[PDB]
């Protein structure tokens, strides 16, 4: 054949079957050799179209196409540029088969007819199913030259307005790709509207998309909207990453809770975000302390929040320790009650190391300080042994060591101390011989 003879004439030899292409070890060597040989072959102007028919022979052989898996170098000829596009458009609906074609075309050699390619891609995606459409959308930012990004953005927005299943990959592609400032407001509004109606699987990706692009003042108001819309939902890593990479988002959150939450009760996620912000200036801790002193965030809901949100407690330890230390010295009854219930909940943390650390912190607080602190420490200890003595028996060595060093205290304190030792010893009489 003409194509077979031309391929072996120069450039890269086309091994039949599973054999690799016989050419030099260089990407540009093929373009220098085979393209020059084809140009020399192009003395007959009318045979090139016949050579295109010969190229169709290379398209005819399925084994030849599989051996092709080069294809990019052959498709790089300026004269035969539309031929490759026509072949791809014909083989698209015929049939991860199109994934390889998209990868080869994505970030490929440019062409002046990129508008035609964009229109053909849109037409194919109009009929293509969900996964092929998603693959085409992911390949779109590589394919697009970025000059006509506005029209692509408008088309993507229109498709996002209708396609329920394609919202996630389209939003991800738009976030990855650049966009005009005027369309930014429309994108933000569209993303914010679908938050209550968004699916659970694509929820964190959409939340990252809305929280990453916008860095303006009006997002504070959007935070107020996300005070309500996000609360309706009822991985968590993307929020932490966005807050870590965006301190302005932290300031916006702080201002949003300061202005709006004061006269709209509160929410569990608000307290969790407060803890996360405090863990990561530390003004949020002071604001939360002021709010609790005013009488916000009742501990009755805090107990349910700590019980249900096991991951947040298991997420990282020292936030609870810092909060307990801050609330222990509170001058109001609400603050000290909150700290007491907070340590009571923290004792229920499944981590044995964290549990013993919390018990050690309680013993340290009981060790010295104000007498009221010792009284509340003994009160929470008697509440604990009323709750479960077996769990406290595990760390009984520290309690016994602390009790042995009781230099002085009120007679009621000594009565309570020897009561807790006696109760722990006798209730644990199976293994309490070492304490009696």
């Amino acid at each position: 054949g003409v194509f077979e003879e031309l391929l072996r004439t120069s450039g890269i030899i086309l091994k039949v079957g599973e054999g690799q292409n016989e050419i030099a070890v260089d990407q540009t060597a093929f373009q220098k050799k085979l393209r020059v040989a084809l140009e020399k072959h192009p003395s007959y102007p009318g045979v090139v179209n016949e050579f295109i028919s010969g190229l169709e022979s290379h398209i005819k052989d399925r084994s030849q196409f599989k051996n092709c898996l080069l294809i990019k170098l052959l498709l790089g000829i300026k004269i035969l540029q539309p031929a490759v596009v026509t072949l791809l458009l014909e083989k698209i609906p015929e049939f991860n088969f199109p994934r390889l074609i998209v990868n080869q075309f994505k970030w490929l050699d440019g062409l002046l007819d990129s508008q035609d390619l964009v229109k053909k891609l849109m037409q194919m995606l109009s009929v293509s199913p969900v996964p092929i459409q998603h693959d085409i959308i992911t390949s779109l930012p590589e394919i697009l030259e970025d000059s006509q990004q506005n029209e692509v953005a408008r088309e993507l927005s229109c498709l996002l307005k209708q396609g329920r299943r394609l919202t996630v990959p389209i939003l991800d592609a738009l976030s990855r790709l650049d966009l005009d400032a005027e369309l930014l407001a429309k994108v933000r509004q569209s993303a914010m509207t679908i938050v209550p109606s968004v699916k659970l699987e694509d929820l964190p990706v959409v939340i990252k998309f809305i929280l990453h692009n916008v860095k303006a003042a009006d997002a504070v108001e959007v935070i107020s909207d996300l005070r309500k819309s996000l609360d309706l939902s009822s991985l968590f890593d993307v929020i932490k990453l966005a807050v870590r990479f965006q301190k302005d988002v932290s300031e916006a959150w702080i201002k949003a809770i300061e202005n709006s939450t004061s006269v709209s009760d509160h929410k569990v996620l608000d307290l969790i975000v407060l803890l996360l912000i405090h863990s990561t200036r530390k003004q949020t801790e002071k604001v939360l302390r002021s709010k609790i002193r005013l009488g916000c965030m009742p501990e009755q809901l805090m107990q349910n929040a700590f019980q249900n949100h096991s991951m947040v407690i298991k997420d990282f330890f020292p936030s609870i320790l810092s909060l307990a230390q801050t609330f222990l010295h509170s001058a109001h009854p609400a603050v000290v009650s909150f700290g007491s219930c907070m340590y009571k909940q923290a004792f229920a943390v499944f981590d044995s190391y964290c549990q013993q650390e919390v018990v050690c912190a309680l013993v340290t607080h009981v060790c010295s300080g104000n007498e009221t602190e010792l009284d509340i420490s003994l009160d929470v200890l008697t509440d604990l042994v009323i709750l479960h003595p077996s769990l406290l028996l595990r760390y009984a060595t520290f309690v016994k060591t602390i009790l042995d060093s009781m230099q002085k205290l009120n007679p009621c304190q000594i009565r309570k101390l020897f009561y807790i030792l006696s109760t722990l010893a006798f209730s644990q009489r199976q293994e309490g011989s070492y304490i009696q």
């Binding site: 697009l144 970025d146 990855r176 650049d178 990479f245 301190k247």
Partner: protein, 471 residues
């Protein structure tokens, strides 16, 4: 060590004193505590890449200071550098250049880090956003200039082709990459031939090769509204490239022929040839007007570059200086309707030539230039503008504009001419303003170098200072 670290966060002027105090403590305790090197390295490396909330350039300076002392220390604590590299193009505030310059000793010895960094650069160059792209190409220039190609020639050709693919980009990246091209040009040799071929390919599009037609530059192509082709910087870079090629000793024949043709057409040119002729032709805040402003500032830059080139080659020739005066007349005629691309060495040589240029060999060549008072005013004005740039910023534009020794030598040269002109006996008050700016700038920046400067204009600083006050 805990106090030394905490002082950095405390500082966020006595605050500068506290930050310097923390840097000194960390440097001293690293120099002293031999067993504790790894802990300090891990702590500072983790703190460096924690979060880009604010400028952390002083942390990068500390990183350079700690790593330059102990070269092998970085090799032991490796495999964390790649994690930092994974997210370098997030908040680049020019700290990426310092970080790369600091960790270059790690890169040259280890190939795995080189492969990872090349992967990150490949990710950056194909990115579709300009903000990451600028940092990517800026680091890419440092990568290219770091490794010598004297003897990986095939690797150099491939990576240069990868860089050359970047020429179709935004305006800012095109603007910035020419300085890196000049640096890597001065660093290497075969890269000179390849990159000179690339520049010829770039300029052949805009040259418009012909004869007997006005406006040789096809400026209308780069109208937009926003600019995307800094022609003046391109011509300046090409001029310096050709000058270095001639110094270090066909495309050069084509270059010199094109430059001769365009300057010959330019002297035989007028504003009628250009779109903007005179009187009411443009206005601010109007589409055609904002368009025409771009052509105006661009062709002013081109005129400056051609004046520099013609003075460079025109070794004491009346006709060349007449042509230079013609370009100056065009530049001033356009200027009256409404920075500069000159070099330090050129400005110093020009000032020394104009003032105190006593030599019988001159056939009144400088006499033609000395007739135009506007030329003298412009010559002093460019020096004032560049000195103001040096005072306000760290370094001035143009080639060799960041080596401190060259700047100090050029300042020492300029000050003598300005003092001589004022003492010889408007022009004079402008020289006084220049001298004031020199003295304030050198007081602020070059502290230790004060004595040698006082030796240059002619030990105890007070005697020479009192001599100048007596003057």
């Amino acid at each position: 060590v805990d106090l030394g670290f905490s002082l950095m966060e405390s500082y966020e002027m006595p605050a500068q004193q506290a930050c310097k105090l923390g840097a000194s403590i960390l440097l001293e305790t690293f120099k002293v505590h031999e067993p504790i090197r790894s802990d300090i390295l891990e702590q500072v490396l983790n703190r460096v890449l924690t979060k880009a909330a604010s400028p952390v350039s002083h942390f990068i300076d500390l990183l350079s200071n700690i790593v330059v002392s102990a070269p092998l220390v970085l090799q032991n604590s490796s495999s964390r550098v790649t994690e930092t590299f994974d997210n370098l193009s997030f908040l680049p505030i020019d700290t990426v250049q310092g970080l790369l310059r600091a960790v270059q000793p790690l890169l040259k010895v280890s190939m795995s880090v080189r492969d990872s960094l090349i992967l990150v650069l490949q990710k950056a160059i194909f990115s579709r956003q300009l903000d990451a792209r600028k940092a990517a190409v800026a680091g890419f220039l440092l990568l290219l200039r770091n490794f010598k190609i004297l003897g990986n020639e095939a690797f150099c050709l491939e990576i240069l082709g990868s860089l050359r693919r970047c020429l179709s980009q935004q305006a800012d990246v095109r603007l910035m990459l020419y300085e890196g091209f000049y640096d890597v040009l001065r660093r290497n040799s075969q890269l000179a031939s390849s990159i000179m071929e690339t520049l010829l390919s770039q300029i052949k599009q805009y040259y418009l090769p012909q004869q007997d037609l006005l406006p040789p530059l096809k400026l209308e192509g780069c109208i937009m509204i926003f600019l995307q082709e800094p022609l003046a910087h391109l011509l300046c870079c090409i001029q310096h490239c050709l000058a270095w090629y001639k110094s270090t000793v066909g495309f050069e024949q084509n270059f010199e022929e094109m430059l001769e043709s365009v300057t010959r057409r330019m002297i035989k040119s007028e504003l009628e040839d250009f779109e903007l002729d005179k009187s009411a032709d443009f206005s601010p805040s109007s589409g055609v007007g904002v368009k025409n402003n771009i052509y105006a500032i661009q062709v002013m830059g081109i005129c400056e570059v051609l004046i520099e080139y013609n003075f460079k080659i025109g070794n004491f020739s009346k006709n060349k200086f007449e042509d230079v005066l013609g370009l100056f007349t065009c530049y001033n005629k356009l200027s009256e309707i409404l920075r500069s691309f000159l070099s330090m060495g050129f400005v110093s040589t020009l000032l020394t030539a104009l003032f105190r240029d006593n030599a019988q060999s001159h056939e009144e060549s400088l006499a033609v230039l000395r007739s135009s008072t506007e030329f003298m005013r412009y010559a002093v004005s460019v020096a004032l503008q560049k000195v103001q740039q040096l005072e306000e910023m760290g370094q001035t534009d143009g080639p060799d504009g960041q080596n401190p020794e060259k700047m100090f030598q050029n300042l020492c040269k300029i000050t003598r001419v300005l003092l001589w002109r004022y003492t010889s006996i408007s022009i004079s008050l402008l020289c006084l303003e220049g001298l004031l700016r020199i003295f304030n700038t050198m007081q602020q920046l070059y502290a230790a170098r004060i004595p040698q400067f006082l030796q240059a204009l002619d030990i105890n600083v007070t005697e020479k200072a009192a001599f100048q006050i007596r003057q």
